[PDB]
Symmetry: C3
Amino acid sequence: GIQTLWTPPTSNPNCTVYTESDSLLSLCLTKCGAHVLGSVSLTGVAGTMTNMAETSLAIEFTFDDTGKLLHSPLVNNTFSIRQGDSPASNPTYNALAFMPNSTLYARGGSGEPRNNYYVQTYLRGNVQRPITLTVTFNSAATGYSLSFKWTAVVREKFAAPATSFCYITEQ
Amino acid sequence: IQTLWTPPTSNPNCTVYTESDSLLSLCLTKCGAHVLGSVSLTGVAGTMTNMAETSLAIEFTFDDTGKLLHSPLVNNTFSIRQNALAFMPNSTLYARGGSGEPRNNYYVQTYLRGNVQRPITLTVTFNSAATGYSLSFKWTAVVREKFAAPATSFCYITEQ
Amino acid sequence: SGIEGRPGIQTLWTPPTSNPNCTVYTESDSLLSLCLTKCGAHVLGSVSLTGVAGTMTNMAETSLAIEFTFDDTGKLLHSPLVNNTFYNALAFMPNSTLYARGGSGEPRNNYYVQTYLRGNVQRPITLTVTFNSAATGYSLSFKWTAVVREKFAAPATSFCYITEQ
Ligand SMILES: CC(=O)N[C@H]1[C@H]([C@H](O)[C@H](O)CO)O[C@@](O[C@H](CO)[C@@H](O)[C@@H]2O[C@@](O)(C(=O)O)C[C@H](O)[C@H]2NC(C)=O)(C(=O)O)C[C@@H]1O
Ligand SMILES: CC(=O)N[C@H]1[C@H]([C@H](O)[C@H](O)CO)O[C@@](O)(C(=O)O)C[C@@H]1O
């Protein structure tokens, strides 16, 4: 039943890029065989996220060698199984079935082209503002990781539209 | 049930400007909280072969139970492949009436007719409709040229 | 083997490798990752290709193409894999009604991906994935643009097609 790891859809800020609860992140990973299908978007809500000082923005989810979450930008690290996918309390799952394959995407391999997945989108959906999202698999030297870097425009609000990506899993 | 689609076909099944003027492929497959969608649209007759406008938009609208209300298909062929809300775009993340919100939009780069001199954008929008659910597609087009949009795909989080 | 199927069968893939497994111009000159997973009527595909040796590290042409060709039962006939060897195979084949055989000239038989050579944004390239270019049986073709006198590597990408069964 457990095919999904996500942060729950919400209309309230749930993410901290520069200051607490300054943004609304969606991240969802669903398993289809040896693939994870991932979706992500990030909307600035407050502070610097509404008036950027830098030309790029990056966040990262890191996991240990068992697939257990170590760090994320989410307020209260609300990244877990989707509720209702198991009738049991405290549902167990194989977290490695959602981790990026460590043979194809070597740890510490952010400089390797095959560890990176590139997405073209538009800042705030404005078609005069093309930006790139770079998703990197296993940048971290130990454990597993998913890293997201978007290009951005200074002195404007940041928001990245709905996007998606796909990687091969460890198990 | 894992798949909602219009069945593969090689003859026109879709009405953009006039009856059966185009061939639409649309297929939605459920994987956990995601739908993986594929779409393409090939002009076959009439204005679809000699465009009058510089964009083309079609929409699938559903009621609040996930039942199809309208689409550009010639016949009622959008169907389960031989819980509707499990295929609908999430209405918390993609707010109804939210076509103007960036997170309700998914952008795809492709090429008109597969022509490298004709880069175009497909915008897929989730829940543009004020009520119920919707999937909307809008492609750039070139006037006085044929319209065809190659194979593309997209992904969204579901309601249930 | 070169392509292996995993559980009934939901995944066809090149097994993960640290070493070259593919022959574009010369034997074992590249590392290919190709993975096809069945999700209802879709295959979700991922692909990347890293040059390791020879012309792959110093390109002579502005594009590179490889193809996986299958017979009408879905059996693998040929691929660029070093280990050129390999369940309802038709469940993984591109749909021959929508993607007609010999139809590489039909826009709907082609899926375009924008990416960056060696992950360098000053080097935009396109991947064209084509379904059923073969006049008989089934096929998946991959063509990337490239830059002469530079090393070839195409980053992680993905694509999706409707299946025959
Ligand atoms: C994902 C990523 O970070 N990609 C970068 C790649 C990549 O790290 C390497 O290709 C992996 O081996 O490197 C890019 O820069 C390279 C080297 O880092 C170039 O600047 C080349 O540097 C040289 O020193 C080299 O060949 O090593 C000289 C060479 O002439 C340079 N290449 C050119 C043609 O600019 C890369 O483009 O490969 C940057 C990329 O973002
Ligand atoms: C999807 C969409 O329509 N995007 C539009 C956005 C958003 O509607 C607002 O940012 C919502 O707050 O508004 C713009 O003025 C912008 O910010 O550049 C133009 C852009 O085309």
